[PDB]
């Protein structure tokens, strides 16, 4: 029986169902998924203020690197407040004589229509290959509220919420930590973020 | 002296060592962001029969106010459902449930954490709720507290 | 006013370029043919590339 | 020519992304950093 031996870390399996914790777990699993009840937290800390688009690019790169790791369902942060990419953030989104003149005006409107179609296509598919947040959007109160939640008051660090796939309190759930740390370290490499400190925490 | 059960209950020991990287990371996040200094959190889950409405939001806001009022146990509450920007993440797909993560004083297993979990349950349950809305306190710390309580029982 | 709008749009394009340069982004790449004629790349192509 | 320069930069990126490699320099990265004013958004 030695080879097949394995262990689990979810204590809700080792308790009677009538206990309040099991009831809450049952409700949450009825409505939400299991991984959401036990998320993870990661903080990347630097020595300078990150409340500018240039550092936002690196932050989104780190978020993408974290999400691409196997077994990670979704990652939310200042660049992904609800786990999805911010809308209108992709680069493609940013991308007699009188009668003759009006035809050029009509052509311009058609080209304006063409750009809208591409933007809608990129938004509907939740594409996240390219990213840029213009400086004006930083002034909107929506991001002011967000930056006070996911970033420190001095703006020297940003927290990431990481949600696993399936039950996060298994052997694989505990084994996914090293992959996340390696992914973050590789994502930082080559950027001005080099020299930062990474903290990983949570149940797993 | 009292019975062994009471003495054990009032002299609990934190499950995780201080040197553990996870506890250090959580405390570092708490102290850097100037929100809390603990390492244990619970997730209050509001389950509803019909999809949650504006009255559910009002009840949620009142409960959050009550939680933040009690500085003894609760240290920091992040109301992701409260803000519209992150409201999508907190609320379920069907829209009939929503959860909020609350940080409690004391580390997991330690008797202080169990007392904090009990206080949180009291706060979340004693208040009058909209008909069809029920509150449930769950999470790792709550599971640890239930484990200790059931063993002693 | 349309001219002023164009200048503001020109300012917007500069900000994106500055952000992408500062962040050292490298996702997309293209070297225009004209830049190949500059002596800076002439010196480089004689070092990292065979004759 | 630019067409082959695209492939060269792709190879350089693939090499750099390998674990344990600090920086790769070549004709498309003379000092280990990407050449300035080379990103597509810059052209945009």
């Amino acid at each position: 029986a030695l080879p097949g031996y394995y262990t689990t870390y979810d204590d809700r399996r080792y308790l009677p169902d009538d206990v309040p914790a099991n009831v809450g777990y049952d409700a949450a699993f009825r409505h939400f998924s299991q991984a959401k009840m036990n998320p993870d937290l990661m903080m990347v800390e630097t020595d300078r203020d990150l409340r500018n688009p240039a550092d936002f690019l690196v932050i989104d790169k780190i978020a993408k690197a974290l999400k691409n790791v196997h077994g990670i369902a979704q990652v939310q942060t200042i660049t992904r407040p609800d786990g999805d990419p911010i809308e209108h953030s992709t680069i493609p989104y940013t991308i007699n004589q009188y009668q003759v003149q009006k035809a050029q005006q009509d052509q311009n409107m058609a080209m304006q229509e063409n750009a809208t179609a591409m933007s809608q296509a990129f938004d509907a598919a939740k594409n996240d290959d390219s990213f840029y947040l213009p400086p004006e959007a930083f002034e909107t109160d929506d991001f002011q509220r967000g930056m006070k939640l996911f970033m420190s008051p001095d703006g020297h660090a940003v927290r990431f919420t990481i949600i696993h796939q399936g039950d996060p309190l298994t052997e694989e759930g505990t084994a996914r930590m090293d992959e996340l740390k390696v992914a973050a370290a590789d994502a930082i490499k080559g950027t001005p973020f080099e020299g930062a400190r990474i903290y990983l925490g949570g149940s797993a | 002296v009292p019975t062994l059960d009471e003495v054990g209950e009032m002299r609990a020991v934190s499950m995780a060592p201080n040197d553990a990287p996870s506890t250090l990371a959580i405390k570092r996040v708490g102290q850097v962001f100037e929100e809390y200094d603990t390492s244990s959190s619970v997730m209050i889950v509001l389950e509803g029969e019909e999809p949650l409405g504006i009255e559910a939001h009002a009840f949620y806001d009142k409960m959050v106010a009550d939680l933040r009022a009690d500085t003894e146990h609760v240290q920091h509450v992040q109301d992701f459902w409260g803000d519209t920007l992150t409201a999508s993440g907190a609320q379920s797909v069907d829209g009939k449930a929503a959860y909020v993560q609350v940080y409690i004083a004391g580390d997991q297993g330690e008797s202080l954490a169990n007392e904090s979990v009990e206080a949180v349950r009291k706060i979340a349950t004693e208040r009058e709720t909209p008909s069809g809305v029920k509150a449930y306190v769950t999470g790792a710390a709550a599971t640890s507290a239930d484990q200790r309580a059931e063993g002693d029982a």
Side-chain angles (χ1 to χ4, degrees), chain A, chain B residues 1-133 135-153:
Chain A
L2 168 66
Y5 168 62
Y6 76 98
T7 172
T8 185
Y9 314 95
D10 196 2
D11 312 4
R12 72 174 299 273
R13 302 172 54 86
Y14 297 85
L15 291 179
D17 300 0
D18 59 348
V19 305
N22 272 16
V23 181
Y25 275 138
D26 291 3
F29 303 157
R30 280 199 308 276
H31 292 314
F32 300 93
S33 65
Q34 303 181 10
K36 296 183 63 60
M37 294 307 109
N38 300 317
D40 287 338
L41 178 60
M42 166 169 290
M43 189 186 72
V44 175
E45 175 179 345
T46 334
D47 319 65
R48 65 182 184 277
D49 190 1
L50 309 183
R51 292 176 285 197
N52 45 3
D55 297 331
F56 262 59
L57 304 185
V58 197
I59 290 180
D60 186 62
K61 178 182 178 182
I62 293 182
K64 290 190 303 180
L66 290 185
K67 181 177 181 58
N68 289 9
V69 180
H70 188 55
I72 298 301
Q74 67 176 16
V75 176
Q76 76 168 8
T77 177
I78 183 57
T79 69
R80 288 176 165 182
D82 47 356
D84 309 356
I86 298 178
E87 290 73 11
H88 308 165
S89 66
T90 50
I91 285 297
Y93 177 88
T94 303
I95 306 173
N96 173 82
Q97 306 84 352
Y98 172 85
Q99 309 302 323
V100 179
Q101 299 150 10
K102 189 55 184 178
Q104 260 72 357
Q105 173 65 25
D106 301 1
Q107 170 68 15
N108 174 83
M109 298 306 301
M111 296 190 300
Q112 178 67 215
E113 178 189 8
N114 297 131
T116 56
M118 178 169 56
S119 309
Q120 294 145 358
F122 274 76
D123 287 357
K126 296 183 178 179
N127 182 270
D128 47 4
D129 310 325
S130 61
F131 170 86
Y132 175 72
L133 202 64
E136 295 78 2
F138 287 75
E139 318 307 316
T140 59
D141 301 0
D142 287 61
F143 281 83
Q144 297 299 333
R145 301 176 308 173
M147 284 186 297
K148 293 180 302 182
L149 303 188
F150 298 113
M151 292 188 62
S152 61
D154 53 359
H156 301 182
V158 52
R159 69 174 66 162
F160 297 86
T161 293
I162 311 177
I163 305 179
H164 300 254
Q165 292 181 335
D167 196 0
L169 296 187
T170 65
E171 300 194 354
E172 310 88 356
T174 57
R176 291 191 188 102
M177 308 287 93
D178 317 7
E179 300 181 5
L180 295 184
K181 301 182 63 59
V182 168
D186 296 355
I188 293 186
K189 169 219 301 179
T191 63
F193 281 19
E194 283 179 339
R197 294 167 297 280
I198 312 173
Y199 302 87
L200 180 58
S203 306
Chain B
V1 282
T3 73
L4 177 57
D5 144 72
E6 316 166 22
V7 177
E9 189 179 29
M10 67 191 305
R11 299 291 181 271
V13 175
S14 166
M15 184 181 69
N18 313 330
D19 311 3
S22 65
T23 308
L24 294 173
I26 300 300
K27 290 186 177 181
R28 180 61 170 171
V29 173
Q31 64 184 16
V32 162
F33 284 76
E34 308 171 4
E35 298 181 355
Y36 57 95
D37 69 326
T38 168
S39 65
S40 63
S41 60
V42 299
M43 285 185 155
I44 307 182
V45 178
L46 285 76
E47 182 180 20
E49 308 171 1
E50 292 300 325
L52 305 179
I54 303 181
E55 69 292 345
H57 285 82
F59 167 78
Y60 168 87
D61 298 349
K62 191 56 182 300
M63 186 185 59
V64 162
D66 280 358
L67 285 179
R68 292 183 172 179
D70 187 7
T71 62
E72 198 263 63
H73 308 266
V74 178
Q75 287 193 351
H76 174 74
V77 173
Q78 49 176 11
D79 32 3
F80 283 169
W81 195 39
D83 196 274
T84 56
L85 180 59
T86 76
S88 180
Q91 190 161 348
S92 62
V93 178
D94 53 3
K96 302 190 292 185
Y99 71 96
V100 47
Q101 181 179 7
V102 177
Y103 292 82
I104 49 182
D107 308 16
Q108 186 180 4
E110 178 179 344
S111 64
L112 190 57
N114 305 328
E115 183 185 7
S116 304
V117 169
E118 295 303 325
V120 168
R121 272 166 179 162
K122 174 189 304 305
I123 292 184
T125 46
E126 73 171 3
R127 40 168 48 257
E128 47 181 346
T129 72
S131 184
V133 183
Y136 310 109
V137 181
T138 183
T143 306
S144 171
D146 274 3
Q147 171 187 24
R148 186 221 55 82
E150 295 312 314
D152 277 342

